Design a protein around this ligand. Sequence first.
Ligand SMILES: COc1ccc(C[C@@H]2NC(=O)/C=C/C[C@@H]([C@H](C)[C@H]3O[C@@H]3c3ccccc3)OC(=O)[C@H](CC(C)C)OC(=O)C(C)(C)CNC2=O)cc1Cl
Ligand SMILES: Nc1nc2c(ncn2[C@@H]2O[C@H](COP(=O)(O)OP(=O)(O)OP(=O)(O)O)[C@@H](O)[C@H]2O)c(=O)[nH]1
Ligand SMILES: Nc1nc2c(ncn2[C@@H]2O[C@H](COP(=O)(O)OP(=O)(O)O)[C@@H](O)[C@H]2O)c(=O)[nH]1
Lengths: 430, 438
Amino acid sequence: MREIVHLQIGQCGNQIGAKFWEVISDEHGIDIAGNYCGNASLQLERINVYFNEAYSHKYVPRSILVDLEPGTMDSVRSSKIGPLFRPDNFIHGNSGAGNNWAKGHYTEGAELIENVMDVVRNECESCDCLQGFQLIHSLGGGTGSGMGTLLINKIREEYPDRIMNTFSVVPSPKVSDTVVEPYNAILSIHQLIENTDETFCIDNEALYDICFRTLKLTNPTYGDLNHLVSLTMSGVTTSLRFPGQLNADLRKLAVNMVPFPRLHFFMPGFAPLTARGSQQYRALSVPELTQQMFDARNMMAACDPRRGRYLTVACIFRGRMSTREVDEQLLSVQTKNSSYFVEWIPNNVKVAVCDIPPRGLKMAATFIGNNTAIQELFIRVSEQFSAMFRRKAFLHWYTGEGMDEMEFSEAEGNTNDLVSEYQQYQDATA
Amino acid sequence: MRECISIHVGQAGVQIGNACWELYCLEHGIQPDGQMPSDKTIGGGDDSFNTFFSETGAGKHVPRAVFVDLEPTVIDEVRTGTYRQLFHPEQLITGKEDAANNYARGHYTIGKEIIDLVLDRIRKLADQCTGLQGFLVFHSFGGGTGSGFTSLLMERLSVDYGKKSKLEFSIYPAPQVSTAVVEPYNSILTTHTTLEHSDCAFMVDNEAIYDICRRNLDIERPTYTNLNRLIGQIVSSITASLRFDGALNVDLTEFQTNLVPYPRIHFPLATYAPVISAEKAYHEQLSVAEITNACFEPANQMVKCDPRHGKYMACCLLYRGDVVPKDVNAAIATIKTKRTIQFVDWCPTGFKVGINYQPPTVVPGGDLAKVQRAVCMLSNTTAIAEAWARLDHKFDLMYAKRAFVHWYVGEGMEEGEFSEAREDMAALEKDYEEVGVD
Ligand SMILES: COc1ccc(C[C@@H]2NC(=O)/C=C/C[C@@H]([C@H](C)[C@H]3O[C@@H]3c3ccccc3)OC(=O)[C@H](CC(C)C)OC(=O)C(C)(C)CNC2=O)cc1Cl
Ligand SMILES: Nc1nc2c(ncn2[C@@H]2O[C@H](COP(=O)(O)OP(=O)(O)OP(=O)(O)O)[C@@H](O)[C@H]2O)c(=O)[nH]1
Ligand SMILES: Nc1nc2c(ncn2[C@@H]2O[C@H](COP(=O)(O)OP(=O)(O)O)[C@@H](O)[C@H]2O)c(=O)[nH]1
């Protein structure tokens, strides 16, 4: 029996992970006391990937909540999910990294790696078999980005035969006013290129765009964005949480979706995306779900997939739908729009149907795609990095923590080489 | 005096073999606990189902089966199902980590850590058999275990059991129900590795079974249960010459001589006529001439390819049920008047008809209808070169930009093995064309 170890680093990672574990426990029929209360036996099957079953039917998650400040742990414990998590798995330092990637990767991160690796080894030693690691963090902040990439490197050192999956939240100028978030984002992207096998590029710019245009919110808070990411992260791991045809159990998902070792940045999407308290007025059927699944306005990365080629698609449908109509609609989408898919990867669109929908929606459609359009996201973050780096603003806060100035140029060169490789595999034809 | 050891590698092999052993126990009347009502009156072996069912001292008919997977899911499924006590727990081998739809994981890293246990179980089953002919390896071309561990097992059984002949019942990949994108890679690599180690390989694709289920059993969403039941019917009446009285194909050597002229041209094509839905059971009957014509129908084959564009080499018509041998020759003559079937330019013999009078049994609750006349047409033709050309076309498409290759070189394999397997399949295409050109 395989099992994923979940890690949440930073304020954004902790808040999104708390909402994610709430939606996962609602889907699996688990209350906050760790007792099963669903009416279906499918929810109890393949529960060992995420929930650690203790004695007398106690379902505690295998979440390692990590920060450098105890305020996020106090905010998690202030909610209903505080008693749900393991209290020994909360790790927080004395002071935060303060939007400094070097201060979260070289000093405070380095002094907290031994404690978090002790907790990681404590979770790992009780495994009958380890599947891989799932990390939720943000590339913008200091502790999230810096200690996330440090924990990624340390996990890659200790367990090099295990897969590494990240849910990396790329920062935006439309949601945060901090200026050095391109520095942390580009340095973490340079680490994630070389030290990770699976990355779900969630962009706060795309979430702000969805909450601004689609959801009709004048002032989108962090709650609406975290609700969107919790919906998409619940729908993405519905292949891991449930048995199915396209099981895609982490290593199988990486074998299917990743053709090239650096092009492992996915573009998640969720077709009936609606704000809280308003999802009961959505008409749901198959071809509207398929036509909203591939929409650029609906997709959760600030990219235009019409300007790129889908290298590999993993469309997972959720709810009570006829799989004949789902497969007919997706083959119609693949054939009628054959210019948007690569011709050198035959049958790159994989369809699965899970009969358990997320709560609040009768039918749902979660899309995972290794599209080539994510080079627009990397071009945007690298151009903000170049605008903040060509005149060396705030480099003294990074070089004062022991970071060389060559590391910023190495990160810029690595992200530009990744953009060049994406453009090369876009322009090539079989 | 004749004994066979069925091996089921991978999820497809394990599920297909479980359905096949269910149909074998249904055909032989064996109870699920292992006892027999009729043929346990003797209490001894060598009653022509001792090739597959070994008899213990308690009268239990334990099958000569080895179920291998690197994942314990389907092994626990057959350990929980209705034949949980029929199969010994020592012969049902599970694993911890999967091969994850990778050939190099199941052949070099994950399959290499379990190959000695499977070899030990194979030798433990072979030490009980005094007249062992060989093995029937049930696997799939697409998956990681069913390609890589099958290739490793074929290498080990060739270096250990070199006087034995090994059949294969492989599952050719279909895009309709596919678990992975790299199924052409695993298929070409395991076909290159098990070309020198397989003697007669009956590859059946799920696309033809899908089309047959949708157009005959009227299921627009065929699950794996309907496909498993149909392929279990196909393989059961393939093996019905071997588990029953002696007319033809009574041995694995007879299989290798009646159909297989070359060491590399060893891919026959099976065809089955009476695939009818359970609702349409009493609508009409089926004559011998029309079921022979449907056995020569290109839409009824177990491989989606066209035999009329290629040239035949052999035909072993295997009739089941109460079929009189008189009108079979009239059906043969009406087939022979059709010059679409064009044999090779050597002495071609013809349609080697053998008739088994045991009626065919279908699974109760299955979608297949109970029939009185059944027919299996094992034909060696050059039409399988179309399927291998489709596989090498997808291989060339994915390998032009070296997509997904890092998942294979990272698990111990070399870069040049892909080009070597591509050249071997090009040579197999050339061999099929050279037989096809006269
Ligand atoms: C276009 O290609 C074809 C054209 C026609 C056919 C029809 C097919 N021709 C062949 O099998 C040719 C076989 C070559 C020898 C080979 C050379 C023997 O050393 C092999 C051997 C076998 C067993 C033990 C020791 C040695 O096999 C036989 O003599 C087999 C052995 C039987 C008694 C078991 O006996 C027959 O032949 C049968 C079963 C009585 C009739 N067979 C046929 O009509 C097939 C093909 Cl593929
Ligand atoms: N007919 C039929 N085909 C099956 C069945 N199960 C799996 N397959 C085929 O198996 C192919 C892939 O192999 P897998 O199912 O992944 O099994 P495997 O060889 O063990 O591969 P891994 O599980 O990853 O180790 C697919 O293309 C399916 O067509 C089945 O029950 N019936
Ligand atoms: N989508 C989303 N992003 C967030 C949320 N909270 C913070 N962020 C982003 O994540 C970054 C904060 O990183 P953080 O974990 O606080 O690092 P720290 O400043 O060192 O503690 C900022 O760039 C924010 O843009 C949230 O609730 N939702």
